Motif scaffolding. Structure first.
Motif, PDB file in Angstrom:
ATOM      1  N   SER A  56       0.924  -1.227  -0.025  1.00  0.00           N
ATOM      2  CA  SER A  56      -0.074  -0.111  -0.138  1.00  0.00           C
ATOM      3  C   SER A  56       0.822   1.290   0.013  1.00  0.00           C
ATOM      4  CB  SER A  56      -0.863   0.085   1.358  1.00  0.00           C
ATOM      5  OG  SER A  56      -0.220   0.088   2.484  1.00  0.00           O
ATOM      6  N   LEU A  57       2.175   1.242   0.135  1.00  0.00           N
ATOM      7  CA  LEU A  57       3.065   2.236   0.184  1.00  0.00           C
ATOM      8  C   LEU A  57       3.829   2.644  -1.324  1.00  0.00           C
ATOM      9  CD1 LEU A  57       4.609   2.128   3.541  1.00  0.00           C
ATOM     10  CD2 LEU A  57       2.794   3.522   3.031  1.00  0.00           C
ATOM     11  N   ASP A  58       3.671   1.825  -2.307  1.00  0.00           N
ATOM     12  CA  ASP A  58       4.346   1.609  -3.611  1.00  0.00           C
ATOM     13  C   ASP A  58       5.679   1.500  -3.213  1.00  0.00           C
ATOM     14  OD1 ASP A  58       1.762   2.079  -4.521  1.00  0.00           O
ATOM     15  OD2 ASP A  58       2.323   4.348  -5.192  1.00  0.00           O
ATOM     16  N   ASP A  59       6.011   0.606  -2.193  1.00  0.00           N
ATOM     17  CA  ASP A  59       7.546   0.475  -2.258  1.00  0.00           C
ATOM     18  C   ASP A  59       8.449  -0.151  -3.372  1.00  0.00           C
ATOM     19  OD1 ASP A  59       8.051   1.451   0.693  1.00  0.00           O
ATOM     20  OD2 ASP A  59       6.617  -0.171   1.221  1.00  0.00           O
ATOM     21  N   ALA A  60       7.584  -1.047  -4.029  1.00  0.00           N
ATOM     22  CA  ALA A  60       8.234  -1.471  -5.242  1.00  0.00           C
ATOM     23  C   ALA A  60       7.077  -1.979  -6.308  1.00  0.00           C
ATOM     24  CB  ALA A  60       9.417  -2.787  -5.094  1.00  0.00           C
ATOM     25  N   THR A  79      14.505   2.329  -7.098  1.00  0.00           N
ATOM     26  CA  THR A  79      14.585   2.949  -5.885  1.00  0.00           C
ATOM     27  C   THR A  79      13.415   3.526  -5.514  1.00  0.00           C
ATOM     28  OG1 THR A  79      17.139   3.196  -5.892  1.00  0.00           O
ATOM     29  CG2 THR A  79      15.892   4.843  -4.468  1.00  0.00           C
ATOM     30  N   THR A  80      12.869   3.400  -4.098  1.00  0.00           N
ATOM     31  CA  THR A  80      11.593   3.919  -4.040  1.00  0.00           C
ATOM     32  C   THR A  80      11.282   5.461  -3.943  1.00  0.00           C
ATOM     33  OG1 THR A  80      11.430   1.838  -2.588  1.00  0.00           O
ATOM     34  CG2 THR A  80       9.746   3.608  -2.225  1.00  0.00           C
ATOM     35  N   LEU A  81      12.059   6.033  -3.347  1.00  0.00           N
ATOM     36  CA  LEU A  81      12.371   7.551  -2.768  1.00  0.00           C
ATOM     37  C   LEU A  81      12.923   8.377  -3.974  1.00  0.00           C
ATOM     38  CD1 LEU A  81      12.537   7.153   0.788  1.00  0.00           C
ATOM     39  CD2 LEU A  81      10.466   6.993  -0.227  1.00  0.00           C
ATOM     40  N   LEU A  82      12.752   9.423  -3.730  1.00  0.00           N
ATOM     41  CA  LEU A  82      13.508  10.883  -4.430  1.00  0.00           C
ATOM     42  C   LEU A  82      14.459  11.502  -3.440  1.00  0.00           C
ATOM     43  CD1 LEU A  82      13.836  12.792  -6.571  1.00  0.00           C
ATOM     44  CD2 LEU A  82      11.960  14.255  -5.672  1.00  0.00           C
ATOM     45  N   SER A 135      17.330   8.749  14.741  1.00  0.00           N
ATOM     46  CA  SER A 135      16.993   7.422  14.916  1.00  0.00           C
ATOM     47  C   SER A 135      16.389   6.861  13.767  1.00  0.00           C
ATOM     48  CB  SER A 135      15.761   7.668  15.955  1.00  0.00           C
ATOM     49  OG  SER A 135      16.315   8.242  17.086  1.00  0.00           O
ATOM     50  N   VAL A 136      15.591   7.347  12.839  1.00  0.00           N
ATOM     51  CA  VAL A 136      14.827   6.779  11.688  1.00  0.00           C
ATOM     52  C   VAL A 136      15.513   6.805  10.342  1.00  0.00           C
ATOM     53  CG1 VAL A 136      12.608   7.092  10.508  1.00  0.00           C
ATOM     54  CG2 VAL A 136      12.561   7.617  12.955  1.00  0.00           C
ATOM     55  N   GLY A 137      16.571   7.374  10.379  1.00  0.00           N
ATOM     56  CA  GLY A 137      17.180   7.858   9.353  1.00  0.00           C
ATOM     57  C   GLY A 137      16.864   8.520   7.958  1.00  0.00           C
ATOM     58  N   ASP A 181       4.133  11.295   0.795  1.00  0.00           N
ATOM     59  CA  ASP A 181       3.735  10.679   2.140  1.00  0.00           C
ATOM     60  C   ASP A 181       3.700   9.038   2.250  1.00  0.00           C
ATOM     61  OD1 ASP A 181       2.532   9.876   4.688  1.00  0.00           O
ATOM     62  OD2 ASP A 181       0.538  11.245   4.162  1.00  0.00           O
ATOM     63  N   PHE A 182       5.034   8.766   3.100  1.00  0.00           N
ATOM     64  CA  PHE A 182       5.037   7.413   3.080  1.00  0.00           C
ATOM     65  C   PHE A 182       4.159   6.702   4.271  1.00  0.00           C
ATOM     66  CE2 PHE A 182       7.041   5.293  -0.455  1.00  0.00           C
ATOM     67  CZ  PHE A 182       6.856   6.701  -1.205  1.00  0.00           C
ATOM     68  N   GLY A 183       3.502   7.378   5.070  1.00  0.00           N
ATOM     69  CA  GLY A 183       2.882   6.899   6.167  1.00  0.00           C
ATOM     70  C   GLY A 183       3.777   6.595   7.549  1.00  0.00           C
ATOM     71  N   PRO A 184       3.048   6.028   8.556  1.00  0.00           N
ATOM     72  CA  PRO A 184       3.849   6.060   9.811  1.00  0.00           C
ATOM     73  C   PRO A 184       5.025   5.539   9.904  1.00  0.00           C
ATOM     74  CG  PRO A 184       1.294   5.887  10.081  1.00  0.00           C
ATOM     75  CD  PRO A 184       1.598   5.941   8.444  1.00  0.00           C
ATOM     76  N   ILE A 185       5.893   5.782  10.632  1.00  0.00           N
ATOM     77  CA  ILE A 185       7.292   5.051  10.761  1.00  0.00           C
ATOM     78  C   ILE A 185       7.034   3.813  11.423  1.00  0.00           C
ATOM     79  CG2 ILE A 185       8.249   7.335  10.673  1.00  0.00           C
ATOM     80  CD1 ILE A 185       8.870   7.282  13.804  1.00  0.00           C
ATOM     81  N   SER A 186       5.842   3.702  12.057  1.00  0.00           N
ATOM     82  CA  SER A 186       5.791   2.370  13.058  1.00  0.00           C
ATOM     83  C   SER A 186       4.237   2.224  12.969  1.00  0.00           C
ATOM     84  CB  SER A 186       6.598   2.216  14.265  1.00  0.00           C
ATOM     85  OG  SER A 186       7.872   2.162  14.127  1.00  0.00           O
ATOM     86  N   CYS A 222       5.452  10.494  10.540  1.00  0.00           N
ATOM     87  CA  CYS A 222       5.365   9.895   9.015  1.00  0.00           C
ATOM     88  C   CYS A 222       6.517  10.214   8.319  1.00  0.00           C
ATOM     89  CB  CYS A 222       3.845  10.600   8.453  1.00  0.00           C
ATOM     90  SG  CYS A 222       2.404   9.910   8.668  1.00  0.00           S
ATOM     91  N   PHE A 223       6.706   9.209   7.548  1.00  0.00           N
ATOM     92  CA  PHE A 223       8.195   9.140   6.738  1.00  0.00           C
ATOM     93  C   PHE A 223       7.991   9.905   5.377  1.00  0.00           C
ATOM     94  CE2 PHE A 223      11.685   7.569   4.590  1.00  0.00           C
ATOM     95  CZ  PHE A 223      12.619   7.614   5.332  1.00  0.00           C
ATOM     96  N   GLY A 224       8.942  10.804   5.234  1.00  0.00           N
ATOM     97  CA  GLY A 224       8.885  11.583   4.050  1.00  0.00           C
ATOM     98  C   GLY A 224       9.550  10.891   2.634  1.00  0.00           C
TER      99      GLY A 224
HETATM  100  C1  LIG Z   1      10.246   4.804   8.118  1.00  0.00           C
HETATM  101  N1  LIG Z   1      10.248   3.700   7.150  1.00  0.00           N
HETATM  102  C2  LIG Z   1       9.476   2.375   7.683  1.00  0.00           C
HETATM  103  C3  LIG Z   1      11.159   3.505   6.184  1.00  0.00           C
HETATM  104  C4  LIG Z   1      12.796   3.512   6.703  1.00  0.00           C
HETATM  105  C5  LIG Z   1      13.685   3.513   5.650  1.00  0.00           C
HETATM  106  C6  LIG Z   1      13.324   3.523   4.330  1.00  0.00           C
HETATM  107  C7  LIG Z   1      11.949   3.484   4.067  1.00  0.00           C
HETATM  108  C8  LIG Z   1      11.547   3.037   2.541  1.00  0.00           C
HETATM  109  C9  LIG Z   1      10.218   3.174   2.145  1.00  0.00           C
HETATM  110  C10 LIG Z   1       9.218   3.132   3.043  1.00  0.00           C
HETATM  111  C11 LIG Z   1       9.538   3.254   4.348  1.00  0.00           C
HETATM  112  N2  LIG Z   1       8.387   3.448   5.242  1.00  0.00           N
HETATM  113  C12 LIG Z   1       8.020   4.465   6.143  1.00  0.00           C
HETATM  114  C13 LIG Z   1       7.661   2.059   5.718  1.00  0.00           C
HETATM  115  C14 LIG Z   1      10.752   3.485   4.820  1.00  0.00           C
END
Ligand SMILES: CN(C)c1cccc2cccc(N(C)C)c12
Length: 330
Positions: free
Chosen positions: A12-16, A222-225, A247-249, A279-284, A290-292
């Protein structure tokens, strides 16, 4: 000849995105991640360390009548994220969306790192960068796109990636009904083996366009920009409460915030990434942080226009003798 295949996000996040590929005779169908940032076609197989397979469909070259072991060849690859795979090499028939290549190098996985084993939806990678990055030794091998080039009506493939929805990879033709307007083509450097190009600037939300050259690669794998620190700081400064977290990277932001869009330049044209795509949703699970989708390239060495940017556009990868990259809105 042409080919056409649907690509579907894995979550649901379009990770790949995964695309069915037929390998062998009779066909064995595996779901591969098409990767314009690498140049190896490798699959989980019956030679995979059993402990490193968790739900993947495996290629079984002993069940294929056209498979031949490429005697002595091995391969070993590491990706930007710290993931790795290696093994030996078969040749076999490979078809994508009706397009057939005989004698394609199919790299079988003896060993895969933990991230690949954990992802049960991805049966392998299909690399679509330039063949000079192929890791097969002692005889470097060609990509699917390079071997199929001779038979294609036009030496191009196109990436039409969906936002939380399926999309299309086409080989050998440009679909005129898949984009609005005109395609802007820009020069590619093959110097490093990537689809490397230069963006002409950026804008944050409805701010004014900043003309500046950003060298980067078009990477469906690669997922992100990933952009220079100055650009990414200017974007996240516009989001109340956004911050970079050790912490989150990367940059995180309050999930209650609205993200502005992000525009990048292609020659004189502009591609606008809607804020929702970032918007890549909550970090956990349950977090209000939420993760950018836009992160700094500083620790990578290279700017990457990944799926976040590419899914906002119709993208032509033109493998003519002088390669070029095409962008259109859609
Ligand atoms: C915060 N988190 C879980 C993440 C950390 C590192 C890389 C990510 C790449 C894509 C999606 C993520 N999500 C937020 C699920 C990533």
């Amino acid at each position: 000849s042409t080919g056409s295949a649907t690509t579907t996000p894995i979550d649901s996040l379009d990770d790949a995105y995964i695309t069915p590929v037929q390998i062998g005779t009779p066909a064995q169908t595996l779901n591969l991640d098409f990767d314009t940032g690498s140049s190896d076609l490798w699959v989980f197989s019956s030679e995979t360390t059993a402990s490193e397979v968790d739900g993947q469909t495996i290629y079984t070259p002993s069940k294929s009548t056209t498979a031949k072991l490429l005697s002595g060849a091995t391969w070993s690859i590491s990706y930007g994220d710290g993931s790795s795979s290696s093994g030996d090499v078969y040749t076999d028939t490979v078809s994508v969306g009706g397009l057939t290549v005989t004698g394609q190098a199919v790299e079988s996985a003896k060993k895969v790192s933990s991230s690949f084993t954990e992802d049960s939806t991805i049966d392998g990678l299909l690399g679509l960068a330039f063949s000079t990055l192929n890791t097969v030794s002692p005889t470097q091998q060609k990509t699917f796109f390079d071997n199929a080039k001779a038979s294609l009506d036009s030496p191009v493939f196109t990436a039409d990636l969906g936002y939380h929805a399926p999309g299309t990879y086409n080989f050998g033709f440009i679909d005129t009904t898949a984009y609005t307007g005109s395609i802007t083509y820009t020069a590619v450097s093959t110097k490093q083996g990537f689809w490397e190009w230069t963006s002409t600037g950026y804008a944050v939300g409805s701010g004014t366009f900043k003309s500046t050259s950003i060298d980067g690669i078009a990477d469906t794998g690669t997922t992100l920009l990933y952009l220079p620190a100055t650009v990414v700081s200017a974007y996240w400064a516009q989001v109340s409460g956004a911050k970079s977290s050790s912490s989150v990277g990367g940059y995180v932001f309050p999930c209650s915030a609205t993200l502005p869009s992000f525009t990048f330049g292609v020659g004189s044209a502009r591609i606008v990434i809607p804020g929702d795509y970032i918007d890549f949703g909550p970090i956990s699970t349950g977090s209000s942080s939420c993760f950018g989708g836009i992160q700094s390239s500083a620790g990578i060495g290279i700017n990457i226009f990944g799926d976040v940017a590419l899914k906002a556009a119709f993208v032509v990868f033109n493998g003519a003798t002088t390669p070029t990259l095409g962008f259109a809105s859609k």
